[PDB]
């Protein structure tokens, strides 16, 4: 299973958090299996339904 490089997730600037517009407190909860994220949503399938 894929894993995240610590050099980029964890640091004084969280580079992964900067790119993805999140926070390290809102990334450790995910790449360490504490909370889910919504990978993608269906926009039209929700607009008509």
């Amino acid at each position: 299973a894929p894993v995240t490089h610590i050099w980029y997730f964890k640091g004084v600037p969280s580079r992964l958090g900067y790119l993805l517009d999140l926070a390290p407190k809102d990334l450790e909860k995910i790449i360490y299996f504490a909370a889910y994220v919504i990978t993608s949503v269906d926009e039209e399938m929700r607009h008509n339904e």
């Binding site: 450790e28 909860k29 360490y32 504490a34």
Partner: protein, 59 residues
């Protein structure tokens, strides 16, 4: 005390914690399923027997 919103959301917030220690997080999660007794064990064993019988029938 226990009712009137003092302890319920208290329990929900206490459970909903960062749990930095990995063993601590695993023990927190394992504290979610109640223990079982003999009748429950034999009932679930019957269910598994039915499931494997149905799998054999599918095969």
């Amino acid at each position: 005390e226990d009712e009137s919103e003092a302890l319920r959301q208290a329990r929900k917030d206490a459970e909903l914690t960062a749990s930095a220690d990995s063993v601590r997080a695993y023990l927190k999660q394992i504290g979610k399923v109640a223990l079982l007794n003999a009748e429950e064990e034999v009932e679930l064993a019957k269910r598994i027997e039915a499931g494997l019988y149905a799998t054999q029938l599918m095969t």
